[PDB]
Amino acid sequence: MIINHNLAAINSHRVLKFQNEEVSKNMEKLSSGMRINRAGDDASGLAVSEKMRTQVN
């Protein structure tokens, strides 16, 4: 076996980190209590929510 590189380890690390990113996103979504906390989740939805907030105020 090629001991100069652990390709399976690299793949596992990659998928683990890209799952950790999603779990962090879900954790922050849970903590904030709002579906759209940061921007970019949906720009149209964020803008609509902002102007409806203005309307209710």
Partner: protein
């Protein structure tokens, strides 16, 4: 200030902090490499022993 501080800390951590899972594999790889190198070296010391059969 709260928002800026948390984002600033995240940005700083993205640069200076190390990902343990990222290079613990490299650490194990290098341990295997050093063990193989030591084995091959120790094999190399006894290589010229075959000359003595001619004396």
């Amino acid at each position: 200030l709260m928002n800026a501080y948390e984002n600033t800390q995240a940005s700083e951590s993205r640069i200076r902090d190390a990902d343990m899972a990222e290079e613990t594999v490299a650490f194990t790889k290098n341990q295997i490499l050093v063990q193989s190198g030591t084995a091959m070296l120790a094999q190399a010391n006894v290589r010229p022993q075959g000359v003595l059969s001619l004396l």
